[PDB]
Design a protein around this ligand. Structure first.
Ligand SMILES: Nc1nc2c(ncn2[C@@H]2O[C@H](COP(=O)(O)OP(=O)(O)OP(=O)(O)O)[C@@H](O)[C@H]2O)c(=O)[nH]1
Ligand SMILES: Nc1nc2c(ncn2[C@@H]2O[C@H](COP(=O)(O)OP(=O)(O)OP(=O)(O)O)[C@@H](O)[C@H]2O)c(=O)[nH]1
Lengths: 165, 741, 322, 165
């Protein structure tokens, strides 16, 4: 009965990550306007996952969707780093919400295959994740078409969930 | 459209003829004749469209054919309309389209089980919707559009038909209403500067039966069909036919009215008949539903319409808004909890969606004397409902809404205070006269009560304590003419007619306006703000004064045109005694035609008879007698102070408070400087500040959520700033001391 | 909904507010499942009110995207329920809203993929035997209106080239009617030729010898009627577009000939003959071998079958020489 | 068992004549565009009467109705003398229709009760009614609003119908 909230801006690759988790096959993804829900179970715990899209008109409803959520994924497009500051501001605002104090800010630096992928350490420094009020810091690079860090990120999330209780 | 229409028409004729032959005589012969006539042709240059469409229309309208053949005819007509066979450049296209709509309205067939009937009627509804939406529908007439409205509305308000057909009819009604009132949006205002006398009857348009299945008319449609449509919608939601219409019909009528208002806007004021229908009877029905209903859906629709009216047409519906808000506050402070929740939410839609609702209400009401305090009462009711004590035994969702209203008041007051340069605000030394006279409202109420009990004490009181310029007769007449909303009008009748006051009476009657009006309208405007006495001599004196004034204010000319004249100015010139006699006749005919106790009625015969010999010892023209007779048969003379007591009381309250003021028809925020706005804010804050501060502190102390506490502390900060700005020392000390504690 | 109300409170006009933000809660509660029929019905009513009273218009931010998102939500309207009358009412609201959107300028500003999805949705409703009758008739009327609008817009685009030679290499068996999942140049551009080609290919898929047993008689008659309406609206301009004309010439005429030669149902034969005579009258100077072959087959039939077929043929061919 | 057809130009009071025959009342009837049919039981015989509209766009439709017709009532309009030529031409076309030959012609001219009414002999001579051959011919002036002549015309028609059999 776990609650997982996959957030992130447009073009980050959230739908691809959800598809890889659900069926482990690359499928063409249309630009989402609403949400996608596919409850899963990795080993012994149910994983109810809610995916949210961008389009620069649904972020207020991103704020609306924060409810009894313990897992947060904030996939940020590594390419086109000009938009990274907007993602930093949005994740800071999400952290500032009173209903997600007990969350776990986890970020996937996707699109590593594309040229000029930003370094994970530099991205995390730009995110000033060290300023978190003892919540989490799990910047883990990965790829969407191929499985490079997705399994490691899932292991990190399930490990922190298990360590919760 | 590049194809030859002839081949389309011939193909449709062929298919309909084949279908009729398979199913099975005059109709088949007509189709064969049309086929031959169009086969011997190459283009539709000089063949009228009505001939091309006639066999199809006969199949549609004749009630002796199966639903299959009728459906085929409907399909053929829809195919013609989609392909635009009857273009603008075709002979008699107006006649063809009027005929096809007439055929659709009277569609009848003898068919199979209900599924086929629903399919056929859906085809009829779709074709009507398409025709009306096109410009070819703009060329239809008033009568045709009224028939369309009646047919679709009867389909949409019938409980013996499938829900799909009803939904289709409802969608068509919404589309047609939008079309009609959008046309109204840009036509013209007629007689902008000419006054209007309310003489139309509201009970002449009733919904017909669902018989489908098993200027003036004959002219492009404009205002007349809009008026008839509003009359029909009023008949749906009227108080006097609650038993004759289901709840769904009333809800749909309310939704149609709301859609019409949204499409039209603040332009119904220019048209006096539509605005009269909106003001008197539609608002009466809205108030009746609010006060005397138990179903939530109907109350929700009624409240939504009421708030739409307050948002759009609030500058001309002030008395109705005052009455309805007073009734709402009486309800909310005394009905199950769910009703109160619905009322409070649908009224909460107001203070957010208005420039500055409480300030505007305090400017219009609560300052113009003879109007009950509305803004202060609203704020007090909101404060009393915001405490959890009012949450007990009522809905739990009310206190947050009321708190939102109070915080909105504080925020709006702060917004009127952003850049006002407090020193210069204090630099003012001359207070507005409105507030100065507002401070003396209780004295005015005491004087009005004294006048109601006896004028001999009221007049000296009403002159000693201000409120009248001087004891001169002209001033007394002016005060009685204008300020009579709370002054008793039977007392005016019994005072303005006492023999000694024959000077005040003369001046009062001369103070009216009667130029260009017949005797009927003159009597309506005389009795609008004056109740006739009981004794014969008193009525005689009042009528004599009125006759003198009407003759003096309607200077005639020796033209003296007799008959053959629909004019009403230079045609009839009753000297002085002719007016007396005609006015007495009108007063008597009112009682004669509107006294249900007496059997039979006084017809026009011998009514024209026992009047000859008055207008210069001859008879009044036929037009004038007929007009006054019709105007009394319809719209009984509205008089003030009918009777107060038990049994029928809502009707009397509405009559006295609204119908008297709506007989004759002729914002302020944009007209006031910021300093005056802040002065009104200062007055309302002085009146209702401690209550708001105490309520906010109670909510803040009893709260537990962080958002509630933060919002309440911010509101208290704004209250402290307001107190500092206006120098409300006691309130500022209270707020800061409570925060410190 | 509560957040949208808070955002819009005390705003004089929707000047800087994005339209998609305004419409997003409604579209979300329309498209998603697990929401009861009553609530999605109310949401559809709200969307229809926002359309009949023009609110998202030419002077609003992202109005193109707002209407595109509205249509995308409508084409995937899913809900739960208890009875069937509620389902029919909700789907009737969906069909009416789609017909309103497409027949407006904002419909002209839609996308190729979006229009193709609208076509497939309304056609699935109109060719499903498991719905009611009034719903199917509403769907068919909407399909005829949308077809007229699409081909009318076809009669404004200039042909891609008038000097080049077109080689028929695009396959016909690519577009098939999808299942009715509703209820319980490239794309992303203002729609033009590509959606017209896909629509004509779908209509061919409805009436085809290879797809004969997978479609009912009603679906095939409706497809023939739609192609006939398309021809009647378009006219002799369909020969300036090579792909549409190839689809009319080779496969659709093959289907017409197959139905004329190997069918016993009278209604299907009537629809086929009406389309054939329309083709002869409108586009006959460019279809000569096809007309020759079809006329020869018809004369073979007439000169050698309860004879009611023969009466139907002779009447629907008599429309020619008059 | 009788099929009486009422044909005439628009404005001849055909619908008023039909309703006066059916019930005997003055009824305000809008200009009809199609047809209206009622029955009469004036004698022991029961007759069905068909009324047709008189506009210019429907006269060929009149021409379609001529089937198993027993009698024809060609009501004419006793005003607008410029229309008399067209009325006579239409009457000649109806007479030479080769189907209504075996019938009886009756003319009412109900507009006599108005100023400037033409003489019955004058209209009969002008309309060349004397040129008729091998057919019953009889005109009876009347007033639609009042009557009097309507009963006389119906009496003559029913008498000639009885004489036919
Ligand atoms: N080839 C490749 N593509 C990637 C990778 N990561 C992200 N993408 C791109 O990201 C897109 C994923 O689409 P979505 O996840 O739906 O994007 P979104 O976050 O929902 O934002 P919207 O599409 O605007 O709704 C794909 O189309 C890919 O093109 C990657 O690792 N490899
Ligand atoms: N004053 C007067 N008017 C008559 C009389 N008879 C017929 N009319 C006129 O006839 C009109 C009624 O229309 P119809 O009875 O339908 O006339 P019609 O000959 O059937 O022609 P259509 O209207 O096209 O059907 C009324 O408005 C009258 O003006 C009559 O005896 N006296």
């Amino acid at each position: 009965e776990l609650r997982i909230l996959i957030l992130g801006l447009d073009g980050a690759g959230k739908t691809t990550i959800l598809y890889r988790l659900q069926i482990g096959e690359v499928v063409t993804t249309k630009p989402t306007i609403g949400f996608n829900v596919e409850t899963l179970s990795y080993k012994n715990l149910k994983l109810n996952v809610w995916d949210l899209g961008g389009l620069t008109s649904i972020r207020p409803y991103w704020r609306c969707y924060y409810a009894d959520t313990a897992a947060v994924i904030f996939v940020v497009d590594s390419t086109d780093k000009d938009r990274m500051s907007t993602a930093s501001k949005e994740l800071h605002l999400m952290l500032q919400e009173e209903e997600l104090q007990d969350a776990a800010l986890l970020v996937f630096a996707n699109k590593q295959d594309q040229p000029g992928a930003l370094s994970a350490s530099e991205v995390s420094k730009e995110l000033n994740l060290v300023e978190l009020k003892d919540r989490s810091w799990s910047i883990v690079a990965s790829s969407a078409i191929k499985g490079e860090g997705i399994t490691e990120g899932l292991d990190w999330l399930i490990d922190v969930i298990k360590e919760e209780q | 459209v590049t194809v030859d229409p002839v081949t389309i028409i011939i193909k449709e004729c062929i298919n309909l003829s084949t279908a009729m032959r398979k199913y099975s005589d005059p109709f088949l012969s007509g189709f064969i004749q049309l086929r031959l006539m169009l086969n011997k042709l190459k283009n539709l240059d000089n063949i009228d469209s009505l001939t091309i469409l006639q066999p199809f229309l006969l199949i549609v309208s004749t009630s002796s054919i199966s639903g299959y053949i009728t459906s085929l005819a409907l399909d053929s007509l829809q195919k013609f309309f989609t392909l635009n066979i009857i273009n603008e450049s075709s002979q008699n296209y107006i006649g063809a389209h009027r005929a096809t709509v007439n055929a659709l309205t009277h569609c009848r067939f003898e068919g199979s089980q209900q599924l086929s009937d629903d399919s056929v009627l859906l085809k009829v509804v779709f074709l009507l919707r398409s025709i009306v939406d096109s410009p070819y529908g703009d060329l239809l007439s008033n009568s045709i559009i009224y028939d369309v409205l009646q047919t679709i509305l009867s389909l949409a308000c019938n409980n013996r038909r499938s829900e799909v057909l009803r939904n289709a009819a409802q969608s068509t009604m919404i589309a047609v209403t939008v079309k009609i009132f959008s046309k109204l949006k840009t036509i013209e205002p007629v007689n902008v500067n000419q006054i209007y006398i309310n003489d139309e009857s509201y009970t002449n348009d009733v919904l017909k039966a669902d018989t489908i299945g098993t200027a003036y008319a004959d002219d492009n449609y404009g205002l007349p069909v809009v008026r008839q449509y509003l009359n029909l919608l009023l008949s749906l939601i009227a108080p006097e036919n609650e038993l004759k219409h289901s709840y769904s019909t009333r809800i749909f009528g309310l939704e149609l009215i709301q859609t019409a208002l949204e499409i039209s806007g603040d332009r119904l004021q220019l048209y006096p008949r539509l605005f009269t229908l909106i003001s008197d009877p539609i608002f009466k029905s809205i108030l009746f539903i609010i006060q005397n209903t138990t179903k939530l859906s109907l109350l929700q629709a009624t409240l939504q319409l009421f708030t739409t009216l307050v948002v759009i047409l609030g500058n001309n519906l002030q008395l109705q808004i005052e009455l309805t808000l007073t009734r709402i506050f009486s309800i909310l402070l005394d009905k199950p909890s769910i009703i109160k929740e619905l009322l409070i939410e649908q009224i909460s839609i107001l203070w957010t969606r208005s420039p500055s609702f409480f300030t505007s209400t305090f400017i219009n009401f609560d300052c113009n004397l003879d109007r009950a305090d509305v803004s202060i009462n609203f704020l007090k009711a909101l404060t009393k409902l915001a405490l959890p004590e009012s949450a007990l035994t009522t809905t739990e969702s009310v206190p947050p809404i009321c708190l939102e209203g109070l915080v909105s008041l504080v925020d709006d007051m702060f917004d009127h205070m952003k850049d006002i340069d407090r020193e210069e605000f204090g630099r003012q030394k001359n207070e507005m006269e409105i507030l100065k006279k507002r401070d003396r409202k209780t004295e005015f109420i005491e004087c009005t009560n004294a006048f109601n009990e006896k004028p001999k004490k009221g007049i000296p009181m009403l002159i000693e304590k201000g409120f009248i310029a001087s004891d001169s007769d002209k001033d007394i007449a002016e005060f009685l003419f204008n300020n009579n909303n709370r002054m008793n009008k039977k007392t005016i009748g019994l005072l303005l007619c006492h023999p000694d006051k024959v000077s005040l009476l003369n001046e009062y009657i001369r103070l009216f306006d009667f130029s260009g009006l017949r005797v009927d309208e003159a009597i309506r405007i005389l009795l609008t703000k004056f109740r006739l006495p009981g004794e014969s001599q008193q009525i005689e004196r009042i009528i004599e004064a009125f006759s003198s004034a009407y003759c003096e204010n309607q200077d005639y000319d020796p033209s003296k045109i007799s008959d053959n004249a629909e004019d009403d100015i230079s045609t009839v010139q009753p000297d002085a005694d002719s007016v007396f006699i005609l006015s007495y006749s009108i007063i008597m005919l009112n009682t004669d035609l509107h006294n249900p106790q007496v059997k039979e009625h006084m017809s026009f015969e011998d009514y024209s008879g026992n009047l000859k010999g008055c207008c210069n010892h001859k008879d009044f023209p036929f037009w004038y007698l007929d007009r006054i007779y019709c105007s009394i048969r319809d719209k009984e003379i509205v008089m003030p102070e009918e009777h107060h007591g038990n049994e029928k009381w809502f009707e009397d309250a509405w009559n006295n408070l609204i119908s008297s003021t709506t007989v004759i028809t002729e914002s302020v925020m944009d007209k006031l400087t910021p300093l005056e706005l802040l002065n009104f804010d200062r007055a309302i804050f002085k009146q209702v500040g401690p209550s708001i501060v105490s309520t906010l502190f109670n909510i803040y102390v009893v709260a537990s959520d962080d958002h509630i506490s933060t919002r309440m502390i911010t509101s208290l900060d704004k209250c402290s700033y307001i107190s500092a700005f206006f120098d409300f020392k006691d309130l500022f000390n209270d707020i800061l001391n409570s925060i410190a504690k």
